[PDB]
Design a protein around this nucleic acid. Sequence first.
RNA 1: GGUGACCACGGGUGACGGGGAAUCAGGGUUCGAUUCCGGAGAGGGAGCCUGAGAAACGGCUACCACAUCCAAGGAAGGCAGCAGGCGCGCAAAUUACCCACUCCCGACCCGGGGAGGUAGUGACGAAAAAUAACAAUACAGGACUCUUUCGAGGCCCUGUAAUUGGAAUGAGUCCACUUUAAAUCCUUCCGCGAGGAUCCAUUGGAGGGCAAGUCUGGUGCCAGCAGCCGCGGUAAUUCCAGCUCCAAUAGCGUAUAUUAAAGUUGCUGCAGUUAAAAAGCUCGUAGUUGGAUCUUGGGAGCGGGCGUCCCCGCCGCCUCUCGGCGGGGCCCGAAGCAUUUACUUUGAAAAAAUUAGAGUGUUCAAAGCAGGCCCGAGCCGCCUGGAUACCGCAGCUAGGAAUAAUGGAAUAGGACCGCGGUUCUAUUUUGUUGGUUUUCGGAACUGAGGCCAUGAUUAAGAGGGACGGCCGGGGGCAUUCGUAUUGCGCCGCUAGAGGUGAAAUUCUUGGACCGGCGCAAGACGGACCAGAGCGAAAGCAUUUGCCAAGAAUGUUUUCAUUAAUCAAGAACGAAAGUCGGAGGUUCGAAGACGAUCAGAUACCGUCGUAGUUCCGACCAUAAACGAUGCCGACUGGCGAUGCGGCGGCGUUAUUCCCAUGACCCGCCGGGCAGCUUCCGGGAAACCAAAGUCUUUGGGUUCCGGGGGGAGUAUGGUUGCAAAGCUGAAACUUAAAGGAAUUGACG
RNA 2: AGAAGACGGUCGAACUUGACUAUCUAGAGGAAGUAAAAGUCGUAACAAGGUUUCCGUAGGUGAACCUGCGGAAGGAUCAUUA
Lengths: 141, 149, 129
Amino acid sequence: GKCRGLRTARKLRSHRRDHKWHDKQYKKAHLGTALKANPFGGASHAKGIVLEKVGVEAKQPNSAIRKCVRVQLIKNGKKITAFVPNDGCLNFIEENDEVLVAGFGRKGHAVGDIPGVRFKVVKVANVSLLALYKGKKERPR
Amino acid sequence: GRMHAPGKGLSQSALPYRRSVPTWLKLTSDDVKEQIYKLAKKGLTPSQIGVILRDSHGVAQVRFVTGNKILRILKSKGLAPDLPEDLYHLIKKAVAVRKHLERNRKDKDAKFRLILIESRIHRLARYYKTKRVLPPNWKYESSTASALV
Amino acid sequence: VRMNVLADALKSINNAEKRGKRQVLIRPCSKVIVRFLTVMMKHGYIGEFEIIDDHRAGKIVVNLTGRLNKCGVISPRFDVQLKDLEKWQNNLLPSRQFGFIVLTTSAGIMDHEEARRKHTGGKILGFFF
RNA sequence: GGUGACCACGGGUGACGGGGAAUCAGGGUUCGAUUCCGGAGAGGGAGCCUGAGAAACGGCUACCACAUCCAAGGAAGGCAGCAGGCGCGCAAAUUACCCACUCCCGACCCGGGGAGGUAGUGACGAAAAAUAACAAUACAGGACUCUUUCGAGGCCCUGUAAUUGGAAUGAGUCCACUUUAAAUCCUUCCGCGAGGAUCCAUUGGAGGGCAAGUCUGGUGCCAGCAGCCGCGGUAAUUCCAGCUCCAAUAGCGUAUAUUAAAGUUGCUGCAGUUAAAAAGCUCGUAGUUGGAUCUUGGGAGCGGGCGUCCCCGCCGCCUCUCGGCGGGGCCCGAAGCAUUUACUUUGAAAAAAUUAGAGUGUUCAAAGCAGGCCCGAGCCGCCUGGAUACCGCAGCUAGGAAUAAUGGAAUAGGACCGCGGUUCUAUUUUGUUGGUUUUCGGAACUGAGGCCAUGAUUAAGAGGGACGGCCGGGGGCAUUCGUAUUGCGCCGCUAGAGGUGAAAUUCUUGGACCGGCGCAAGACGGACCAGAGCGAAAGCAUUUGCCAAGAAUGUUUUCAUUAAUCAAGAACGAAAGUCGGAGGUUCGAAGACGAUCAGAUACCGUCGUAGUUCCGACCAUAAACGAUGCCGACUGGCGAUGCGGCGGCGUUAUUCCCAUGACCCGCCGGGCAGCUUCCGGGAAACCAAAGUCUUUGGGUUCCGGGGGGAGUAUGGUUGCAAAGCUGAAACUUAAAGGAAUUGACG
RNA sequence: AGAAGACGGUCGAACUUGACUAUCUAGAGGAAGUAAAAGUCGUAACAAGGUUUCCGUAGGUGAACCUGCGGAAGGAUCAUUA
Ligand SMILES: [Mg+2]
Ligand SMILES: [Mg+2]
Ligand SMILES: [Mg+2]
Ligand SMILES: [Mg+2]
Ligand SMILES: [Mg+2]
Ligand SMILES: [Mg+2]
Ligand SMILES: [Mg+2]
Ligand SMILES: [Mg+2]
Ligand SMILES: [Mg+2]
Ligand SMILES: [Mg+2]
Ligand SMILES: [Mg+2]
Ligand SMILES: [Mg+2]
Ligand SMILES: [Mg+2]
Ligand SMILES: [Mg+2]
Ligand SMILES: [Mg+2]
Ligand SMILES: [Mg+2]
Ligand SMILES: [Mg+2]
Ligand SMILES: [Mg+2]
Ligand SMILES: [Mg+2]
Ligand SMILES: [Mg+2]
Ligand SMILES: [Mg+2]
Ligand SMILES: [Mg+2]
Ligand SMILES: [Mg+2]
Ligand SMILES: [Mg+2]
Ligand SMILES: [Mg+2]
Ligand SMILES: [Mg+2]
């Protein structure tokens, strides 16, 4: 069982210390790796240049082509696929155009279908897809 | 459940309420201290005296008859041994295990019963160093052990 | 081995009263036992116990009644600083309406109510309720 | 020499340190570059002047690192003051006005202050709070009353509309005033300023989690949706649209860090038969943890409910050797000091802001700290505030002595003018100063006595240790036997036998196989043999000897807290495996053939190497398994058996009994085990224990946190090497899994 | 009084060459994993999975694999009828 004694404040502290390098959710957060690995250098979103448009094939049970963008981030020069959300919006984005890419909500998990795509596009040439696909702000020229 | 074995047994001695001497007895605190005296002289351990005195002789317990317990009667007169009887029984035992290990270098069993015995020695020793009956120096040594018996 | 002679005893007098046992003896005995059982005697939690005097340690024999749901023991005797006494008697007793944390202060062994009347803290032993 | 696993030393930080913050049943968890305090640096270092005061950067000296002008000789560079720009960037303000407030420096009421205040920018964020209300209609309804209902009176209602209708107001705009420094902003107000088609609320949703439509269009596994579950393949409650509704709503969305949620890091407070999981076993240093046992009952009173029963001040001791509030007391001043703490309670000290929270028509509130009043202002002025609690640990003070350690007398010592011998040395005193010697006071030392009921708590259903009679396939070392087995020797007879779902390679008239008698070598110890035995676990069986070792029981034997578990560190550890060596009984990886098969480099066959056999080193792992850590306590039955003991009631024998010994019947301790049950557990299977667990903590060791990647890579170490031990991540992944249910197929 | 200057010494940026450690990356070619998810060749496992299964070790093999030895039952027998 547990150690339970009265001058055992350390055997306890030091017990509950190491038996966190067996937690998963902290070994992301406190180790290093994460900051080192995620192209998003601990940063909520990030800007990057659209280097080409790529359709991705969804995971078996749901057949469809997902319509994403290969990005290269400015700060790193680290590359990316980002699924351009909402219908017919890939149609907006052209090559070499500067996009603000944010996460998906799973923080590292790829979302649902879109096998291995953490990132979603938000803005395009200082616009925001939400404004374009609603037809509020037009494409700049 | 014992120090060094699985056996969790109990078999021990057990005295009554009563302590006051049991009236058979003649002798008196002196004639017992006259007899412990002559047996230790002859060469017997503090346990072994307590023995002779009960089976053949008369005293349930020396402690009750006289004021104090056997060791103190020998010690306050200077018939007490060099080291504790309790300990050199282990040392004498160790040296006996040593011997046949030194002829029979296969006995894996003897190579606890040594290690254990060694450990039941050291363990004992290091209170006899805090209770200060041994000087804070004496130590086992394999070589010097055989002599010490 | 026998580390704590309460836990020893109190297990065996909770652990009879479950079976509905009429009375039980407690093998090791102590002063602290007596002094904490006599507390249980006042609030009714047991009846009259009659301590045998085997020459060595002591045995006790506790008249039980139905009334004791559980008694237990907090094993390390933490030091209770009177402000904490509440936070304890919240999370260690079934209600604010009965239940008794026996502890051991400056002015003897007693329940938590009696340490509060005298306004003393001290070391938690256990609890019956 | 000093420090160290009470973890130093080494490495790292997305580290300027505090005061606090948001979270929060109690406990934490992360953040605190953030205005308050404390530190540091002005690209980086070093050195410098000067200065009380600086190693000062709105100084300078180089260097390094940066960079400006040039007449090419030279010269001037430091925004981490304020503004501003560039670069970086997911990510952040105006070359604004001013000393009017608070304060500071000066020689100083007088200047200056990008300290500072004021504007501007400013969904960082917090407070308040419009986006309409109401009458009558038209109706749309529904509790009294009236009606069998249909209907109606109507006190009640409410829906939409007509807007029928005027009333009310602000958002704006703008006379005017205040404000302020001048504004601005706010507060004040003249004047204009609401019938929607306006003065116009949006963002997500509408299967579920989750509040809200199998309403209507379109697409048809596309587009697309969907944090997860999912929908989409020709009626989609799921896509794109339309209409309706819902939530919050002036906000509302997604990006991610983090907290609860997390009884998924578990101190409180997780888990370890099977679900992820207890070391193979044992020893053992640190650490943690450790039985009982020591002033009490009682007394004296005051006070609640002749006495009884609650409730209070008392009987910390010692000293007085110490003060004094010619001999004093009186007791405070000192100290034995609280043995030496741990613990508890009371003080004191704790910067403000923040926090908790007193007081207060800010119009409320966040706030603010004032305000209130007295007053018709004749008062030419009164009255009150600016509360308080917490503020860890450590430190300081004072009570208490519940528990935990810890201490004191035992090869003799406390005291008792108890007495002296030796020495020391201080100082009073001999009308003063010196000398000698004294008396005495205080140390130090030490002869010799008196008294001190003169000192050891007990032995643990803790341990340790002695002895006793057994016990046991425990271990070693010798020794002895048994068979079979193959080998050979010989002899007999004879042709097939071994192997097989069937056969052949194979063995054979060169007489195999079989029979007999002989030798041989090595193996292994059959039945007896069991929920039988022992050891730690690997573990352990022919006879006899010797050599140590061990449990258990037995014990008015001794010691007396000596103990449990244990990082660290050791002993042992099938088999397999490896170096040496010895040997080659069978079996037998590897290896050779025969078959079988679509094939079989497999199974089924026939050979047979390493090895299985020995002695000597290593290796250090098992499904090393009861998949159950070790010690310790408690809770039910009932059967059996191994050992020891005890008791009894038997008898076979065995003898005249005996002693025995063998059975029978009991009890007792500790062993291996069984069944049974609504203890109680337990997801379940099950479990006297996996029982004592939200009624949460007896002690302690190890160790798991979705699955894989992976027991991988890398690092370290051990090993001759197989390998052993230590042991990551990116990435991917939604379940993998466990227990039981029906299925259904073997 | 007293400048320029010069001998010495001390802190010492800086520069040059070694050492360490930290961190970060370039890389011909090689071997895993995962994706992942519908290719071929088998069919190792789950039913007596056609050969009870599994561990460790060894040796082998086109691949599951197979075979020794010692284990395991998590079995396909809680029993074998003195
Ligand atoms: Mg042990
Ligand atoms: Mg760094
Ligand atoms: Mg700079
Ligand atoms: Mg400075
Ligand atoms: Mg400087
Ligand atoms: Mg500057
Ligand atoms: Mg911002
Ligand atoms: Mg300013
Ligand atoms: Mg707001
Ligand atoms: Mg509006
Ligand atoms: Mg929903
Ligand atoms: Mg959390
Ligand atoms: Mg909680
Ligand atoms: Mg869990
Ligand atoms: Mg085990
Ligand atoms: Mg035999
Ligand atoms: Mg170890
Ligand atoms: Mg072996
Ligand atoms: Mg071998
Ligand atoms: Mg060999
Ligand atoms: Mg074969
Ligand atoms: Mg293992
Ligand atoms: Mg369990
Ligand atoms: Mg628990
Ligand atoms: Mg995991
Ligand atoms: Mg399994």
